[PDB]
Amino acid sequence: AICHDGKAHFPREGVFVSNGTHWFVTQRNFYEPQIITTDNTFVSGNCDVVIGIVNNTVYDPLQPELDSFKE
Amino acid sequence: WTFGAGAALQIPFAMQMAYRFNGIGVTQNVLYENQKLIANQFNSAIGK
Ligand SMILES: *[C@@H]1O[C@H](CO)[C@@H](O[C@@H]2O[C@H](CO)[C@@H](O[C@H]3O[C@H](CO[C@H]4O[C@H](CO)[C@@H](O)[C@H](O)[C@@H]4O)[C@@H](O)[C@H](O[C@H]4O[C@H](CO)[C@@H](O)[C@H](O)[C@@H]4O)[C@@H]3O)[C@H](O)[C@H]2NC(C)=O)[C@H](O)[C@H]1NC(C)=O
Ligand SMILES: *[C@@H]1O[C@H](CO)[C@@H](O[C@@H]2O[C@H](CO)[C@@H](O[C@@H]3O[C@H](CO[C@H]4O[C@H](CO)[C@@H](O)[C@H](O)[C@@H]4O)[C@@H](O)[C@H](O)[C@@H]3O)[C@H](O)[C@H]2NC(C)=O)[C@H](O)[C@H]1NC(C)=O
Ligand SMILES: *[C@@H]1O[C@H](CO)[C@@H](O[C@@H]2O[C@H](CO)[C@@H](O[C@@H]3O[C@H](CO)[C@@H](O)[C@H](O)[C@@H]3O)[C@H](O)[C@H]2NC(C)=O)[C@H](O)[C@H]1NC(C)=O
Ligand SMILES: *[C@@H]1O[C@H](CO)[C@@H](O[C@@H]2O[C@H](CO)[C@@H](O)[C@H](O)[C@H]2NC(C)=O)[C@H](O)[C@H]1NC(C)=O
Numbered sequence: 081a082i083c084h085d086g087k088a089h090f091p092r093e094g095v096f097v098s099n100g101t102h103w104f105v106t107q108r109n110f111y112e113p114q115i116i117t118t119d120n121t122f123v124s125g126n127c128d129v130v131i132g133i134v135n136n137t138v139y140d141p142l143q144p145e146l147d148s149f150k151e
Numbered sequence: 152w153t154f155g156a157g158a159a160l161q162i163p164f165a166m167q168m169a170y171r172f173n174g175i176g177v178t179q180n181v182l183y184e185n186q187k188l189i190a191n192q193f194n195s196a197i198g199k
Pocket of ligand 1: 099100101
């Protein structure tokens with residue numbers, strides 16, 4: 081799983097992988113890396129339960145769009 | 152199960168169990184949150 085803002089994100093369908101520097105979520109039978117967003121993943125619980133969770137940011141698709149108008 | 156379809160591909164056993172849970176229709180967060188309890192139950196069953 082992934083720790084983003086005190087929450088644990090799990091992949092909807094796929095698995096979290098990293099090439100060495102960045103993290104992606106890909107379908108389990110074909111390497112198709114994709115940016116981890118709130119759509120690929122779903123939240124559940126908090127950060128202090130899962131064994132092996134890792135810090136990483138999660139990109140929210142709606143956030144940049146709204147900030148554009150506000151800017 | 153990958154070694155049954157082709158070349159064996161490694162995967163952490165916790166994640167494999169998460170896949171199995173997804174298979175039986177239970178979200179993997181259940182396993183990732185009850186991992187210790189599930190491991191204890193499995194070991195106890197093997198001992199029994
Ligand atoms: C794991 O995957 C990561 C995927 O992001 C890898 O990080 C990425 O590495 C690539 C390759 O270095 C970077 O791509 C190019 O980045 C700069 C400029 O960045 C712009 O283009 C990127 C295209 O990938 C976008 O992703 C960026 O957002 C940004 O818009 C380029 O200048 C580099 O060179 C290219 O351009 C010059 C000038 O035209 C050419 O001369 C070159 O030949 C080439 O065409 C990179 O190609 C990318 O920025 C980077 N992304 C991130 C988020 O870090 C990561 O390296 C990889 N890790 C391992 C261990 O494999
Ligand atoms: C779901 O099923 C699980 C297995 O039945 C439940 O897990 C059990 O929950 C109890 C309470 O947390 C655990 O007991 C805790 O830890 C130890 C265990 O030793 C005692 O065991 C029994 C009670 O289980 C008790 O009667 C004995 O006298 C022992 O003293 C003790 O310190 C406490 O009892 C403490 O409560 C069990 O150990 C635990 N079993 C396993 C295999 O982990 C679980 O609670 C059920 N409910 C949920 C929401 O998961
Ligand atoms: C995921 O991200 C957070 C940071 O945003 C990491 O939590 C941080 O972990 C360090 C310890 O490694 C904490 O530093 C120290 O913690 C002790 C704990 O009592 C505290 O007393 C000290 O004052 C000091 O802060 C840090 O507090 C903590 N930060 C937060 C906000 O909790 C976490 O480790 C990252 N996960 C992984 C696997 O790296
Ligand atoms: C990786 O496996 C281990 C247990 O070996 C956990 O961290 C390791 O702990 C030992 C003892 O400190 C070290 O020798 C290793 O360097 C540690 N990292 C390893 C083995 O990769 C750790 O919890 C496990 N990582 C995950 C994501 O589950």
